[PDB]
């Protein structure tokens, strides 16, 4: 309803961590709407205009030597410091997946179905989910949602298997995740339900 | 690649005079500062036991951002943001079973500017009881995303929609969900 034009300024101060805290990169990034116009990169050591809109700021800010020294110390004073503060509840966080299996539509044997393995509530994102028919891994006919962020520090994923189920078959979904020491596995039997 | 990223994201939006300050770890929110209450709000209550943040510093950062926005608006010959309308998806927090408490999640993605109107509807009527939401989360393409939550008891009788308004949409976008 409200059609007044909008104007947006964003600033993203980023810390990127490689190999624990052994390598850190700090990026101080300024945006006008969606477009980055100036940044400080710890791998460069000074501000650089990203668009011509940023040229005046880069020139102005690089002429202030105590500003620069402070940005140059951000890898330590800011990045490493904040990693330390949050590490116990972020880097160190692990939450178990919950696994459920169910057919997608209810229908007779010898007719095409999707078996769903739903994996829920886990943290961090890295997971692997495998389908077996009896004891052979099925890698054709696997339709997956990929990793879904729930926005509350958990993820889910749904990994579906295309089947034409026959009477005496067992299918198993197998989940591995850094919170688990041995695979979590759930079975589904080709019965009249 | 890189193990982890922490981002402190701020914005200021005119003429709405609305600002945000938040910290992000691998794409989840750690906390934000409420500009109304002027208070640090932890995404999970647990986080508050391990850490603190002086919400006043966020307020001061946003004043600089406001002042910069005035300058950049002028420097661009008053060129405004181009609306990018959201993608909306609705899913459940866990597999759906009758009478088992669950949560519908409205995931609103790839949009700007960071202003939306989001209503949960149950059978075509607005619902507020037990609902929650996040602030605007930053994306690497500099758009935003946002999540809304609705606790519910699944039934055969009910249908739900996530209703989303945004200036880049011609009409409000509804995304539907019902028990399979």
């Amino acid at each position: 309803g409200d059609t007044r034009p909008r104007f947006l300024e964003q600033v993203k101060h980023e810390c990127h961590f490689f190999n624990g805290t052994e390598r850190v990169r700090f990026l101080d990034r300024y945006f006008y709407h969606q477009e980055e116009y100036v940044r400080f990169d710890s791998d460069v050591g000074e501000y650089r205009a990203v668009t011509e809109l940023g040229r005046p700021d880069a020139e102005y800010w690089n002429s202030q030597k105590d500003l620069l020294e402070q940005k140059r110390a951000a890898v330590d004073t800011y990045c490493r410091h904040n990693y330390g503060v949050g590490e116990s509840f972020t880097v160190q966080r692990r939450v178990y997946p919950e696994v459920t299996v169910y057919p997608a539509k209810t229908q007779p044997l010898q007719h095409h179905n999707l078996l769903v393995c739903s994996v829920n509530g886990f943290y961090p994102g890295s997971i692997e989910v495998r389908w077996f028919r009896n004891g052979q891994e099925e890698k054709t006919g696997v339709v997956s949602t990929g990793l879904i962020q729930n926005g509350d520090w958990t993820f889910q994923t749904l990994v579906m298997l295309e089947t034409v189920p026959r009477s005496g078959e067992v299918y198993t979904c197998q989940v591995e995740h850094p919170s688990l020491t041995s695979p979590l596995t759930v079975e589904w039997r080709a019965s009249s339900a | 690649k890189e193990e982890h990223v922490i981002i402190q994201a701020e914005f200021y939006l005119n003429p709405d005079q609305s600002g945000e300050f938040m910290f992000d770890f691998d794409g989840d929110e750690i906390f934000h500062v409420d500009m109304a209450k002027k208070e640090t709000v932890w995404r999970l209550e647990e986080f508050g036991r391990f850490a603190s943040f002086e919400a006043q510093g966020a307020l001061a950062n946003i004043a600089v951002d406001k002042a910069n926005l005035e300058i950049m608006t002028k420097r661009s010959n008053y060129t405004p943001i181009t609306n990018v309308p959201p993608e909306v998806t609705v899913l459940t927090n866990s597999p759906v079973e009758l009478r088992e408490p669950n949560v519908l999640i409205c995931f609103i993605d790839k949009f700007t500017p960071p202003v939306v109107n989001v209503t949960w509807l149950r059978n075509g009527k607005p619902v507020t009881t037990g609902v929650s939401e996040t602030v605007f989360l930053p994306r690497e393409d500099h758009l935003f995303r946002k999540f809304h939550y609705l606790p519910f008891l699944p039934s055969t009788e009910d249908v739900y929609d996530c209703r989303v308004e945004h200036w880049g949409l011609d009409e409000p976008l509804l995304k539907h969900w019902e028990f399979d």
Binding site: V11, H13, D28, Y30, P56, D57, E59, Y60, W61, L67, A74, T77, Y78, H81, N82, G84, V85, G86 | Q8, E10, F21, F23, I30, F31, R49, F50, A51, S52, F53, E54, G57, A58, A60, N61, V64, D65, A67, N68, I71, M72
Partner: peptide
């Protein structure tokens, strides 16, 4: 045991 997140501060534009 309980630590304090530090904010980065934005610079003022030319």
């Amino acid at each position: 045991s309980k630590g304090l997140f530090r904010a980065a501060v934005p610079s003022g534009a030319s």
